[PDB]
Design a protein around this ligand. Structure first.
Ligand SMILES: Nc1nc2c(ncn2[C@@H]2O[C@H](COP(=O)(O)OP(=O)(O)NP(=O)(O)O)[C@@H](O)[C@H]2O)c(=O)[nH]1
Ligand SMILES: [Mg+2]
Length: 179
């Protein structure tokens, strides 16, 4: 089998851990974990080839900035996430995540991922953003950002409903197999 390393980054609470858990496991017990601390491996088939994808979770909060790069050596693909319910998390894609990952992971493909897609039409989310004169991120804004930062692609998913989650990891595998 082909061995590749994936790292997931993005703003605190944008859904990174949930995304890794829902693709990897068949039962999600009630423990909250800031980062996956066991060795999660995605077994994915791409055009008749078996890829083993080691999934490396990272902490989004800034107090973890000094230790985060320990996760970066020898990465084959990056999942760079924001939350569709958070315009602020999208703004931090070009301002923080892109220069960090480009420094520590030169020439490594980035898949830009809009998480929490289920919240785009959620009434509570709409109201909480509306009170501050904001709204959920639109798909064209994700596309434009992926173009701006030089990402290999833009995808949307929901760890809650599972929509789009297989596709994210299958596309990450395809990107990782290019170099
Ligand atoms: N509605 C909805 N909520 C989600 C989704 N994914 C995660 N959440 C919720 O968002 C919160 C943050 O999730 P989590 O995976 O812990 O975020 P994180 O990006 O790993 N945070 P950190 O960077 O601090 O480790 C949790 O309450 C979780 O239930 C999703 O697709 N939809
Ligand atoms: Mg986490």
């Amino acid at each position: 089998a082909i061995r590749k390393k994936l790292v997931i980054v993005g703003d605190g609470a944008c859904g990174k851990t949930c995304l890794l858990i829902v693709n990897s496991k068949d039962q999600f017990p009630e423990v909250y974990v800031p980062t996956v601390f066991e060795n999660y491996v995605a077994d994915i088939e791409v055009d008749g080839k078996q890829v083993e994808l080691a999934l490396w979770d990272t902490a989004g909060q800034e107090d973890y900035d000094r230790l985060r790069p320990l996760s970066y050596p020898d990465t084959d693909v990056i999942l760079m996430c924001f939350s569709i319910d958070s315009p602020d998390s999208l703004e931090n894609i070009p301002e923080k995540w892109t220069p960090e990952v480009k420094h520590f992971c030169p020439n490594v493909p980035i898949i830009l991922v809009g998480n929490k897609k289920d919240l785009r039409n959620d009434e509570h989310t709409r109201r909480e953003l509306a009170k501050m004169k904001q709204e959920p991120v639109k798909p064209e804004e994700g596309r434009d950002m992926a173009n701006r930062i030089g990402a290999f692609g833009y995808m949307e998913c929901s760890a809650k409903t599972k929509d789009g989650v297989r596709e994210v990891f299958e596309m990450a595998t395809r990107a990782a197999l290019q170099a």
